[PDB]
Design a protein around this ligand. Sequence first.
Ligand SMILES: Nc1ccn([C@@H]2C[C@@H](O)[C@H](COP(=O)(O)OP(=O)(O)OP(=O)(O)O)O2)c(=O)n1
Ligand SMILES: [Ca+2]
Ligand SMILES: [Ca+2]
Ligand SMILES: [Ca+2]
Ligand SMILES: [Ca+2]
Ligand SMILES: [Ca+2]
Ligand SMILES: [Ca+2]
Length: 322
Amino acid sequence: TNHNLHITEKLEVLAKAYSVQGDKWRALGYAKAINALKSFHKPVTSYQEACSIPGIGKRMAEKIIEILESGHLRKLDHISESVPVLELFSNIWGAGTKTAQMWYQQGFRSLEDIRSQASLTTQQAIGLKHYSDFLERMPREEATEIEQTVQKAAQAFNSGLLCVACGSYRRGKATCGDVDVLITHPDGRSHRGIFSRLLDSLRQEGFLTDDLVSQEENGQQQKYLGVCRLPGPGRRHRRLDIIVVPYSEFACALLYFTGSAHFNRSMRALAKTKGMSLSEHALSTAVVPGRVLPTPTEKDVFRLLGLPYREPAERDWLEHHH
DNA sequence: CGGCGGTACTG
DNA sequence: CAGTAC
DNA sequence: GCCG
Ligand SMILES: Nc1ccn([C@@H]2C[C@@H](O)[C@H](COP(=O)(O)OP(=O)(O)OP(=O)(O)O)O2)c(=O)n1
Ligand SMILES: [Ca+2]
Ligand SMILES: [Ca+2]
Ligand SMILES: [Ca+2]
Ligand SMILES: [Ca+2]
Ligand SMILES: [Ca+2]
Ligand SMILES: [Ca+2]
């Protein structure tokens, strides 16, 4: 299926390295080239053929060709030595390239240096203590029991509450990095004030163990990023994301929350090219705030952008099956 | 050459 | 506002 | 990094 496997593996390394150094546009560039190579019907066999692929230009073609002929990629041996440490530090939830570079420059080089000498935000402290647990993907079946816990706790307050698991779960993957749950209510109104009760309920039975992003002073809070752990011996702590949205926002919220990330960016870049704006809240149309278009279902958003409905399993990348 | 998704917490 | 996150 |  990926006929250029030996090429993409090497470019992924290089893309990683730019990403942890904070060269994000260049990393975006690699990421699209790499998907395009995976999606190509045959091995690339010439430079010309490489440039012809959207997402691939002069610089990426040379690397693709160098690799194709010579079997290795030179630049992979001139990667800064800081990269693996920068990666290490960036893998802490709540620390990004800036914090990882500040740590590097303060001279830390391991997690233990971080534990014992770095200054950590509240979030980073939690990311650090659960570093290994958050690095491991969970089986699809564990993700299902996380979703059911949230759903059961919500339906004890109001049985009409609709809870669905999105992200990679809804796109069909066998493992999940974290669970993303979207809650709404078809009556348009009873989603309001839910978090207070739902969080209190999930903390009571011991399920939520730490909160990362949760502005609980707000009665209209709409999101929760935190940490859960299923009951039973030896369970790992997992990342859970919950959003609560009004039903009139359901189609746009579902789309957003299903992702993938890269899919959502391309969908939003597309909408902007047609003088519209796509968010988690709405598809909007004047936009010089413009007006919301009605979108009762995901199908409507796709139609209004001139695309065919894409099944969640096929929402890895927009430009994929094209 | 400049733009590259749009939004929401934290401090 | 910068940083990080989804 | 690539694209318009
Ligand atoms: N930058 C981002 C990140 C995420 N998203 C949307 C919103 C979010 O709900 C959905 C899933 O993102 P996550 O980061 O949870 O990634 P996945 O579920 O695809 O994969 P994994 O958890 O199995 O590793 O994708 C997005 O618009 N923009
Ligand atoms: Ca091209
Ligand atoms: Ca991080
Ligand atoms: Ca997530
Ligand atoms: Ca996820
Ligand atoms: Ca809080
Ligand atoms: Ca440039």
